[PDB]
Each structure stands twice: as C-alpha cells, then as structure tokens.
Amino acid sequence: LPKSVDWRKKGYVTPVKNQKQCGSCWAFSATGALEGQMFRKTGKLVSLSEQNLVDCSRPQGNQGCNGGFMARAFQYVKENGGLDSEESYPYVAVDEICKYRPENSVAQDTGFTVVAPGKEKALMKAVATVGPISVAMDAGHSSFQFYKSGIYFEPDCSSKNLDHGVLVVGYGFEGANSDNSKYWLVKNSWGPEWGSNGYVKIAKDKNNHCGIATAASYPNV
Amino acid sequence: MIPGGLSEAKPATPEIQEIVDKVKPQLEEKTNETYGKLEAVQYKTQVVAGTNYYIKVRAGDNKYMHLKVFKSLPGQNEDLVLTGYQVDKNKDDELTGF
16 A cells, blocks of 8 residues: 555545534535545546535435434435535535435435444555545544644544544655654545644544544445 | 534533623523523533534523534634524423534
C-alpha cells in the first residue's frame, strides 16, 4: 500500500461544505463518499444533495437534522434508484418535504460495503484502493472544536461513542519517517474556516483513535 | 449515540446553569412573559458545526421548559443563541431534538 494517499489530488473531492446548525453530518459524509465513487466511475466530479438525504431518507432509518448514518443514506440511494445534485436540490439545514426528482438524479449505488469494525489496517486498505471513505468519530471534545493544525490526538477520545460522521480522503505521516506521526486526512463539514481549511489530521494507528475505524463504510457503485 | 444525534441526558452543571442565565433575556423576548430564576435541571448536547444544547429548566412554579441553545465554533465570534424553545413541559419529559 502507498505510504501516503490524498484523493483530493486525483479530483475525487468537492470543496468543503457547511452543515450549519443541523445534525446532518451523516449526509455530508455520505455524499462525500458517493462523490468520490461516482468520480471513480465516470471521471466527473458532481456535488451531491445532502438536503435530498435529509428530507427523504427517514424510511431507511435516518432522522434528518436529528442524526443518521451514512450506511442508511447509501441504502436510501439504492432503494430510491438515485440522488439529486446539490445544484438541483440545495441545502437549507432544516428538515423539509422530500423533493427527490428522478430526472435530476446524478448518482446511484447498489448498496454499501462495511470496513472491518475497529481495524485501522482494513481502513487503510479501503482508503488506498477504493477512494474516500465514510467514517464516524468522537468529535464532541473542546480540543476538536479548537483544532487548527497538526495531528489531532485527544486522550479522552472514545473509540465507541461516535457523535459525528466525516470523510477520510487519505492518510500519511508528518516528518521523514513513514511510520512516525501517522495520520488520517479527514474532510469535515463545518466550512473551510474551521480547522485547516476545513480539514483535520487525526492520529493514525494509535489504537483506533476517536473511533475512526469503528464504523466506516463506502457506497458500492 | 449516532452521528448528529443527541447525547444521553446528564444532570445540569454550573456551566449549564450559566448558559441558561446568559440566554434568559432572549427567552423572555420570545414568550413575552418574564421569569424569576430558571433552574437548569438536565441537558443533552448535539454536535453540529458548533454545538446545540438542549436544556430542561424549571420555572419555579413546577413549570418546565425545554431550551435549544446554539454555541458557535471558535472562530465565528458569536455569543450563545437561543435557537428554539418549548413550553409547558413535564418534569420527566425526555429531551429530544427539535
């Protein structure tokens, strides 16, 4: 496997978005992973509608601005036969009436693949060979809110209690040594003003820090 | 716990009481009525691009209300905002996202 990966350099990743005051991270994580896989398939990067997911995926077990899961979003896309573009179905950060229209669908999936739970080596393999991967993490700590740069390591982090869904767009290491200071390169959904232009490096191969490999998945396209 | 979901309830701490105090003016504004002290009893948090606190408070006449207070991320330099509230609540009502 590569010692470093950064899917942004290969055109897989849209600009960082902003979920605002809605608990819709799961939808941003899901569209992020789906944007990557659709790009892999077609070579065309198209920003996808988190609002479509928020409004329409309650039958699959999501709860709009009250939370959800990336797997349930990929399932909705499968059962629904599609997902609209952001341009056609824009985000307003509140639960609204489902406006899915099949004629504006620009992505599909056939389900999803779960990465072996807890296994950072499985997660690494997935990142290196598939593309951006949806993950859940423990992001509720003050240290995460205040994050600006470097490798994030929070001794209080849980591998088990995961309150946020984000996107792993690669991995690598700080410094000369490829097995020191390793990190997951993570796209957040709190706008480009947060963290490092909207991104954060999370400690890698440190006992599944903040639960990054606890519940990772990606859509099958 | 789920991504974007609310946490388990936890009994209020002085910080939470503090958030209620800071935000009291805004509530009086919305409801028209004015309050003696509001006792913060319990709360839940929800992580967004910032933080939503859902706080159960007591009006001191055995009346309860549920407040939704948004705390912005570090760089936005914005103070706490009461983004929602529900009135006429039961002491044992579960705090839920709204």
